[PDB]
Amino acid sequence: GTHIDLLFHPPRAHLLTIKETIRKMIKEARKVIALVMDIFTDVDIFKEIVEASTRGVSVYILLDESNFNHFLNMTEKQGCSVQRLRNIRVRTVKGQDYLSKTGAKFHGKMEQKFLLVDCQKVMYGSYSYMWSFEKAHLSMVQIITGQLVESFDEEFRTLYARSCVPSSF
Amino acid sequence: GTHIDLLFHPPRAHLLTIKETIRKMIKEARKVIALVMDIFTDVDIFKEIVEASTRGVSVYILLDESNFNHFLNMTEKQGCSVQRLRNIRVRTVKGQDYLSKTGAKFHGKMEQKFLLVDCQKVMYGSYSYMWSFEKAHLSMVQIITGQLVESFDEEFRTLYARSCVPSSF
Ligand SMILES: C[C@H](O)CNCc1ccc2c(c1)OCO2
Ligand SMILES: C[C@H](O)CNCc1ccc2c(c1)OCO2
């Protein structure tokens, strides 16, 4: 009782692109959108999320900490003050703490990406929400429904508990 | 008829780490190993692969073209001329051709990471075979059996047809 379809970019034998499928999933949202992403600079996908929040959908976004200022800079160039949108909460996640060869203290990255809508459908895979994934790279995603979606819901809650308010805010 | 389990790094409730489960998957190979990977510098996983080859398992490895020299540098430090192992074939895959605003043509990257053993079991996810995924980063994989494995076999064959002999070789 889990069903899975594969999609690719550039696209193969499927009618929609990965980016067009992400837009559809967000337009179809009725209650909640949960997103985990490493880099998010795509203006078209951002515009779909803001529209959903204006309809009354609760939006929770978890971003890799090292790359967060790329997202904030895009939203400001769009004229948007994302801080002011009450139906959206944006928080950052760090990787492990570690010591380098020279003894300095750094943290790694959250290498995770997925989109979870209404606790019933997930898109999971290697596509990041930036221009390079449209024009330069090969990538793939799964569209997932059924019992496995509950395991993504539990992982989202665990990451939300770990996450912090962004330091730039 | 597809079963999927999740594993994390750092580990959550499961006994084995992601790296221990990769080693297990390789040791259990009877006929064929098929690997697609973006960066491969982990000496311990490479030793498992070479040992499988010596017992007569056929090994096919597809690496991101722009990161190939990191693999070659590792195999040379270990004192192994990998190009002399007849049961291993290593080939590279490029991203899309694109033209920058200064006119120069470039290519992007293959962002895809999976291990397929005996056409029957896959590990798919965000874990790359390098020291930073052990010590620094947060990552996750799926362990997949059943009908979905066929779709990973088809994608492997399609990348294998695209791939080239590395230019050093
Ligand atoms: C005013 C009306 O009620 C809603 N406007 C439709 C609409 C406009 C812009 C959009 C969108 C949808 O999705 C992404 O950007
Ligand atoms: C009997 C002979 O030495 C080979 N089998 C033992 C063994 C040695 C080295 C290995 C390994 C297994 O797996 C990975 O590295």
Side-chain angles (χ1 to χ4, degrees), chain B residues 23 27 44 46 48-52 54-55:
Chain B
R23 288 176 68 200
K27 289 183 188 292
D44 300 322
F46 178 63
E48 291 296 349
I49 287 171
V50 176
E51 173 74 23
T54 66
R55 31 185 229 257

Side-chain angles (χ1 to χ4, degrees), chain A residues 4 8 10 12 94 96 98 108-109 111-112 124-126 133-138 140 142 155 158 162, chain B residues 4 8 10 12 94-96 108-109 111-112 124-126 133-138 140 142 151 155 158:
Chain A
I4 299 200
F8 304 86
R12 272 81 178 293
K94 282 183 187 175
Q96 302 179 65
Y98 73 89
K109 161 173 183 195
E111 284 282 352
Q112 178 65 292
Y124 168 64
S126 64
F133 287 79
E134 283 298 290
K135 302 321 195 176
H137 304 321
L138 311 183
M140 180 188 83
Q142 300 172 333
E155 188 59 9
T158 297
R162 177 182 183 110
Chain B
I4 301 191
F8 311 91
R12 287 206 193 285
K94 293 177 173 181
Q96 306 176 60
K109 311 190 171 235
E111 299 284 343
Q112 176 64 299
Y124 170 62
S126 62
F133 281 84
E134 282 297 282
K135 296 290 93 197
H137 300 327
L138 273 32
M140 182 186 83
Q142 289 172 353
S151 298
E155 184 63 12
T158 298

Side-chain angles (χ1 to χ4, degrees), chain A residues 4 14 36 44 46-47 56 69 74 76 83 99 108 119 126:
Chain A
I4 299 200
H14 47 89
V36 189
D44 300 318
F46 184 64
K47 181 171 299 99
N69 281 317
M74 176 266 286
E76 289 178 337
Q83 297 103 320
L99 300 175
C119 302
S126 64

Side-chain angles (χ1 to χ4, degrees), chain A residues 92-147:
Chain A
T92 55
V93 180
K94 282 183 187 175
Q96 302 179 65
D97 291 330
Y98 73 89
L99 300 175
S100 70
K101 291 300 200 157
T102 69
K105 280 162 202 186
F106 294 131
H107 65 267
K109 161 173 183 195
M110 181 190 67
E111 284 282 352
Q112 178 65 292
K113 44 249 211 195
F114 66 88
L115 176 65
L116 167 57
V117 176
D118 295 335
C119 302
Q120 67 191 268
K121 185 180 281 171
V122 173
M123 180 185 294
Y124 168 64
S126 64
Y127 184 97
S128 294
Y129 291 2
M130 52 189 304
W131 164 93
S132 62
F133 287 79
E134 283 298 290
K135 302 321 195 176
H137 304 321
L138 311 183
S139 64
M140 180 188 83
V141 300
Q142 300 172 333
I143 306 307
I144 302 166
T145 63
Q147 194 167 341

Side-chain angles (χ1 to χ4, degrees), chain A residues 7-129:
Chain A
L7 300 167
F8 304 86
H9 195 72
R12 272 81 178 293
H14 47 89
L15 302 182
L16 297 190
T17 69
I18 292 175
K19 176 159 169 182
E20 293 169 334
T21 309
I22 289 160
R23 293 176 64 199
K24 184 173 192 273
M25 286 184 57
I26 291 164
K27 293 180 187 289
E28 289 175 355
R30 292 355 277 171
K31 310 288 191 248
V32 203
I33 290 167
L35 172 64
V36 189
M37 177 55 53
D38 64 334
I39 309 161
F40 187 177
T41 57
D42 191 293
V43 176
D44 300 318
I45 297 164
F46 184 64
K47 181 171 299 99
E48 293 301 338
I49 286 158
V50 177
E51 177 78 4
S53 80
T54 69
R55 257 149 44 208
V57 176
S58 298
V59 183
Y60 305 100
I61 304 172
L62 300 180
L63 298 177
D64 179 65
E65 198 268 355
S66 71
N67 286 300
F68 173 86
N69 281 317
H70 292 108
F71 173 82
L72 189 52
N73 289 347
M74 176 266 286
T75 66
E76 289 178 337
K77 283 172 171 156
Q78 290 308 291
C80 173
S81 180
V82 70
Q83 297 103 320
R84 310 298 158 185
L85 293 169
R86 298 307 323 196
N87 281 343
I88 304 186
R89 318 310 296 150
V90 190
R91 300 178 69 93
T92 55
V93 180
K94 282 183 187 175
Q96 302 179 65
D97 291 330
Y98 73 89
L99 300 175
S100 70
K101 291 300 200 157
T102 69
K105 280 162 202 186
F106 294 131
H107 65 267
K109 161 173 183 195
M110 181 190 67
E111 284 282 352
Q112 178 65 292
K113 44 249 211 195
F114 66 88
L115 176 65
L116 167 57
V117 176
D118 295 335
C119 302
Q120 67 191 268
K121 185 180 281 171
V122 173
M123 180 185 294
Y124 168 64
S126 64
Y127 184 97
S128 294
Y129 291 2

